[PDB]
Every structure is written in C-alpha cells, then in structure tokens.
Amino acid sequence: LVPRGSPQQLVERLQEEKRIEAQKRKERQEAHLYMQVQIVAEDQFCGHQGNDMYDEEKVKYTVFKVLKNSSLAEFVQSLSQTMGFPQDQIRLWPMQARSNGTKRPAMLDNEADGNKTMIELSDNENPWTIFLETVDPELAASGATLPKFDKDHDVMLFLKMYDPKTRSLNYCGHIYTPISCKIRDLLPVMCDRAGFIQDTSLILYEEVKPNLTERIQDYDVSLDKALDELMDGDIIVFQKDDPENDNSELPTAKEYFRDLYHR
C-alpha cells in the first residue's frame, strides 16, 4: 500500500530511516574493527549421528557482531542480557580445532582471562565459534548456579550412547569430573543418562577422531591413565555388553564410526 500518516508520523518515519542509514554506513566503514562470534548451544549436540559435537553444515549458530578490542567480560555481560540468563548460570567453552582435524570445546577462564581482548582469545579467527554451557531449565529455575570447575584438576568429558539395535548415537550430555576419578565410578552416570538399569555391563570407547575409536580395556584406572592426551572436550562412547548386539548390522561403536568414515 501507498504511505499514509500525519506530519508527526511522517517525520518520525524519516528520522528512523536516516538513523538506520547512518548506523549501516558506520558499520560498513568500521567493518575491519568488528568480528563475527558464532554461539552454539548444547541443544545442537543431540541428534548428531556423526563424529565430534555437531556437523559443520547442519549446526545452527547465534551470530554476534563484536568489536575486536572488546574484553571477554564485556561480551559475557552483553551475551547474558540478550540470551536471558544470569552470568553465574552461563560458561563459555571456545570451539578449538585440534591437530588431528577435530573441532572440540576448549577450556577458557571466564574470570582470569576476562581482561583479555576478543581478538587475542580468538587468535585472529573470524568467525570464532564458542560453546555456550547453560544449567538445565528445571535446575536453573530452582536458583542453582553452574557447578565449580577447577582448571588444574577437573575436566569436561562428553558422553555418547551407541545403540547397535537401532544403528544410532544418543547424546548423554557432559560431566565435570576430576582427572584422578576412575572410569569405574563414571559407569552409573552413563547408565543414568542413557536410561539403563543400575549396574548394566558396558563397553567403553574414546572418540579420538573419525575412523579412530579406541576401546577402554580397563575401568579400574583413572581418566588420565585410560585416555591419552586427556583434555576438555574429549568424547567417551559407551554401549551395552549384550549378546543381542551380535545379530545387528553394526554390533560395536568402533564398527559404526568405521562404516561412517567409508560412506
């Protein structure tokens, strides 16, 4: 339709048009001073049937145009207001590319490295991908802050459940676990998240990279001794130790990832 309105409304519409025009022109010229920040939430992790946290093409990001010389605290504060979550309920884990070609979340001190600029933390990476960790909507409502994480002794291990009967991977979230903690002690948490009976026999693997799924033969050892080069973002793939799996197309997780690699 043709434009209609009072002189008050016409001037206001013209003032708003020039305001956007001036803001867009400044953004076009100051383009070199800004960097794109891609935020990926844990809901993009469930449903993924391949290697790593998500498929680089299927994943949905919340992109933020951040100035390069802005501090980490400046970004967290702006992210907290836009997402609708308090600062104590959120934590940032930047997606860092490993030497083997895998993209996993890395540890970042949201308190000590707060003074550091967004450009130095990203290492001149444009766009920069960060995993936003949030407390469950049920737990976050009951005034519960994000659990305490020790950068020197605690690690963030991601859990995946493989079902040979349905040829599928089922995301079982992440866990804050100390390095000294034994693999045997992590078994009830795996049975809990997968929806299995207490003390169910499991076969454990480490998703190192596509085609490499190494089996954890001993559960009586700590996380550091069982997983080589133990870091934040390491994946543990578990499945039932049942004779029903033998009749299936891909009885093990190791055979599943090998089939996925040669697709």
Swiss-Prot record:
It is found in: Nucleus; Cytoplasm; Nucleus, PML body; Chromosome. Induction: Up-regulated in regulatory T-cells (Treg). Down-regulated during neural progenitor cell differentiation. It comes from the Eukaryota. It is linked to Hao-Fountain syndrome: An autosomal dominant neurodevelopmental disorder characterized by global developmental delay, varying degrees of intellectual disability, autism spectrum disorder, poor or absent speech, and mild facial dysmorphism. Most patients develop seizures. Additional variable features include hypotonia, hypogonadism in males, and ocular anomalies. Belongs to the peptidase C19 family. Monomer. Homodimer. Part of a complex with DAXX, MDM2, RASSF1 and USP7. Part of a complex with DAXX, MDM2 and USP7. Interacts with MDM2; the interaction is independent of p53/TP53. Interacts with DAXX; the interaction is direct and independent of MDM2 and p53/TP53. Component of a complex composed of KMT2E/MLL5 (isoform 3), OGT (isoform 1) and USP7; the complex stabilizes KMT2E/MLL5, preventing KMT2E/MLL5 ubiquitination and proteasomal-mediated degradation. Interacts (via MATH domain) with KMT2E/MLL5 isoform 3. Interacts with OGT isoform 1. The C-terminus plays a role in its oligomerization. This is Ubiquitin carboxyl-terminal hydrolase 7. It comes from Homo sapiens (Human). The gene is USP7.
